[PDB]
Design a protein around this ligand. Structure first.
Ligand code: NI
Length: 759
């Protein structure tokens, strides 16, 4: 048996030959050993009660008689075991594996990843006791997993540059901030980072300390779909480049630009993004059509792999490489572009958490594997979601589970905005990527429960679990940031005017009240929160639920007010309340997170007090449906619920060739309007997504609902998180009818069905 008594020091055995990442994690554990146990860690090289090392690099691993074997030639893996003498042995298959083993002990001591990052103060313990029989083995489901700090102009950049690591250089997020991010990634078992790179920010590799900090923490520096060669064009090109960022006309200067960087960074953990786009987003320069944009890349790959040959590794298949066909580059891939088989292909979601492309059997068999770049934060059309992090766990789950199952297993990268306040989604994503089976065996719901129970208490989480659930479900219906019914990047000013959502007075009141109850629950449960966890509560529960409530209030009272059904002052008050909540955020823990929260990111009209004006049109009328179903109200047919997914948490997958069968009685009127609501996801194989509707055997009507590019329908789809198909059918006038919905393609997910009489 292994026993650590609190108040007492502890000796840790670790060879001095071990990679920086091992020593860094040791520091982190010692920090936690002190916090949790009041126990000062002493690093010897020979004698310890906790022994740590990598396979065939440490004499120490051999000399305590543990059967490591399962670890031999294996990726990022560790064994934890107690030797017969009662010592804790941490045996990693490689250096990262050793690091992750050490940090597992830190999880066992009850230290949250958000210890620092959401002030989840670890509890103190009297003793820590693991069995002589305790034996854990771990390894990652996904090989590269990481985050991208992006859209940082209104949170993480000013917070770093003025509050946490105050700097006089214009947009500096310096070494000390990055060490903090890398702790978070270590504790999340992530290994990869795409640094901030917006024009407002100092490029990572042009910041003194940053590169060396990444080496200390063992993080693969990668970069985005427009940052080819560890090279942030967005910020660096205007500093260090010459002439146009154009390979067709100015390739020598572009090549040089890349080269200098590959030179300074070649003996370092880097993931090299291949290819070429614009300075930030947009077309590449110098080519117009996809046929000319293909000729370019062919030229670009050959030279880019060239530099890698010359400064990194004579065999380039030993250099890790990614190609990311995001936005218009997906088209240029699909025009038959040849990408060398060792290069990881990185698929992209549509910025609203719907993956655009799943690997064909061919792409899947490629030696370089397949990755995904996913968004829980975004700036773009039809509207930014940058303030709160409200994407449903249920949607993240179902998309990312599908991604792994469809063979996207090499590389997962999350766009996380400012990190806060997406703490929960980030950890879900990172858990998925670390151990998919564990997350899959538990609910979506069991994951969130375990998380709230861990961060708040059991007693708080008893009241709060259903609140978070309701939070994510109402945000799925319409995010806080979408409540103005406005658009961004539309090139017409009318889409910037706040305007009615197409909902009835009844639906508005119903929504207003559901939010009221949420705010009330959150207020009451506040005093049942342990003393060391009040800041985490404001950060993780109280700010997002009450922020969201007050946004709905501001915009919904405003809508009632336009139609002379409410007083405008309630809208302003709701506005004032968001302000107050944001002041509190920015003043918690002295002002630890001062500037991290901006309730007007990018100064979008939706975040302002609402312009007072009287409606011209009337309110949407409430419309009586004859029938209203979820996928399981069906008689005949099998459809597995996607756990908490859809408008009423009951969306379900109808597998290809299966059907659901709905039944209903005697109607009036000539005809029936069938209103079918589906998850607006994208085709899993092929380009299709369709279903058939059949009233009373009557020869299936064939209905498609996939979208292409960023069309008007796709814009509608992602704002409301439903594809919508209406159909009018003739009744016979039978007295008993059946409606059969059959799936023709793979990933068809039904959410709602409504009926409506009509003539
Ligand atoms: Ni943000």
């Amino acid at each position: 048996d292994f026993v650590l008594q609190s108040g007492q020091p502890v000796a840790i055995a670790c060879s001095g030959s071990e990679a920086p990442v091992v020593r860094t994690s040791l520091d982190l554990l010692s920090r936690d050993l002190q916090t949790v146990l009041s126990a000062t860690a002493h690093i010897d090289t020979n004698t310890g009660n906790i022994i740590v090392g990598t396979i065939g690099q440490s004499k120490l691993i051999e000399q305590a008689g543990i059967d490591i074997s399962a670890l031999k030639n294996k990726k990022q893996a560790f064994m934890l075991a107690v030797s017969e003498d009662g010592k804790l042995v941490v045996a990693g298959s490689d250096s990262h594996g050793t690091a992750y083993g050490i940090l597992e002990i830190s999880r066992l001591l009850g230290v949250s990843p958000w210890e620092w990052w959401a002030d989840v103060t670890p509890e103190k313990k009297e003793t820590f006791r693991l069995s002589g029989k305790f034996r854990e083995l771990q390894s990652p489901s996904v090989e590269y997993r990481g985050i991208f700090i992006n859209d940082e102009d209104w949170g993480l950049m000013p917070w770093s540059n003025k509050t946490y690591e105050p700097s006089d250089v214009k947009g500096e997020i310096g070494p000390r901030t990055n060490e903090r991010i890398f702790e978070l990634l270590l504790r999340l078992r992530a290994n990869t980072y795409w640094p901030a790179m917006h024009e407002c920010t100092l490029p990572f590799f042009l910041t003194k300390g940053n590169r060396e900090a990444a080496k200390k923490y063992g993080i693969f520096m990668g970069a985005s779909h427009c940052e080819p060669m560890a090279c942030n064009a967005a910020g660096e090109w205007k500093i260090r480049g010459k002439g146009a960022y154009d390979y067709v006309n100015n390739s020598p200067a572009v090549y040089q630009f890349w080269e200098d960087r590959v030179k300074e960074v070649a003996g370092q953990e880097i993931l090299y993004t291949l290819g070429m786009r614009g300075v930030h987003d947009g077309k590449m320069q110098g080519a117009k059509t996809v046929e000319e944009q293909k000729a370019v890349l062919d030229r670009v790959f050959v030279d880019q792999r060239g530099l890698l040959e010359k400064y990194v590794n004579k065999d380039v298949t030993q250099v890790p490489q990614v190609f990311i066909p995001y936005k218009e580059v997906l088209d240029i891939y699909h025009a038959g572009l040849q990408v060398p088989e060792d290069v990881t292909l990185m698929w992209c979601d549509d910025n609203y958490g719907y993956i655009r492309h799943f690997p064909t059997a061919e792409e899947r068999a490629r030696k370089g594997g397949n990755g995904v770049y996913y968004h829980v934060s975004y700036w773009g059309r039809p509207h930014d979601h940058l303030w709160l992090s409200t994407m449903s766990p249920s949607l993240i789950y179902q998309q990312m589970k599908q991604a792994y199952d469809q063979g996207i297993q090499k590389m997962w990268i999350l766009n996380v905005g400012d990190i806060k306040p997406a703490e929960y989604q980030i950890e879900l994503f990172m858990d998925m990527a670390w151990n998919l089976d564990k997350v899959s065996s538990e609910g979506v719901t069991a994951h969130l429960k375990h998380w709230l129970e861990r961060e708040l208490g059991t007693s708080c989480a008893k009241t709060i679990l259903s609140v978070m659930q309701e939070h994510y479900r109402l945000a799925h219906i319409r995010k806080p940031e979408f409540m103005g019914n406005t658009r961004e990047e539309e090139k017409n000013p009318v889409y910037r005017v706040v305007k009615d959502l197409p909902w009835s007075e009844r639906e508005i009141n119903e929504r207003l009240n559901a939010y009221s109850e949420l705010s009330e629950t959150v207020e009451k449960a506040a005093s049942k929160v342990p003393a060391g966890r009040q800041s985490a509560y404001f950060e993780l529960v109280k700010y997002p639920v009450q922020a969201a409530t007050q946004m709905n209030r501001k915009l919904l009272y405003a809508q009632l007010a336009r139609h002379d059904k409410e007083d405008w002052e309630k809208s302003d008050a709701a506005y004032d309340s968001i302000a107050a909540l944001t002041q509190h955020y920015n003043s918690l823990e002295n002002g630890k997170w001062n500037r991290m929260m901006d309730f007007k990111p990018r100064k979008l009209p939706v975040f302002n007090r609402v312009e007072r004006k009287a409606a011209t049109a009337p309110m949407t009328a409430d419309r009586k449906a004859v029938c209203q179903w979820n996928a399981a109200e069906a008689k005949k047919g099998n459809a597995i619920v996607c756990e908490g997914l859809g408008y009423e948490s009951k969306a379900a997958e109808i597998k290809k060739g299966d059907a659901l069968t709905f039944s209903f009685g005697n109607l009036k009127t000539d005809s029936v309007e069938v209103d079918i609501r589906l998850l607006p996801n994208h085709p899993v194989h092929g380009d299709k997504l369709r279903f058939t509707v059949s009233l009373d055997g009557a020869e299936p009507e064939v209905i498609a609902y996939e979208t292409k590019g960023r069309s008007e329908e796709w814009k509608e789809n992602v704002l409301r998180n439903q594809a919508i198909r209406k159909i009018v059918l003739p009744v016979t006038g039978k007295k008993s009818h059946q409606l059969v919905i059959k799936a023709l393609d793979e990933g068809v997910i039904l959410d709602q069905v409504m009926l409506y009489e009509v003539n």
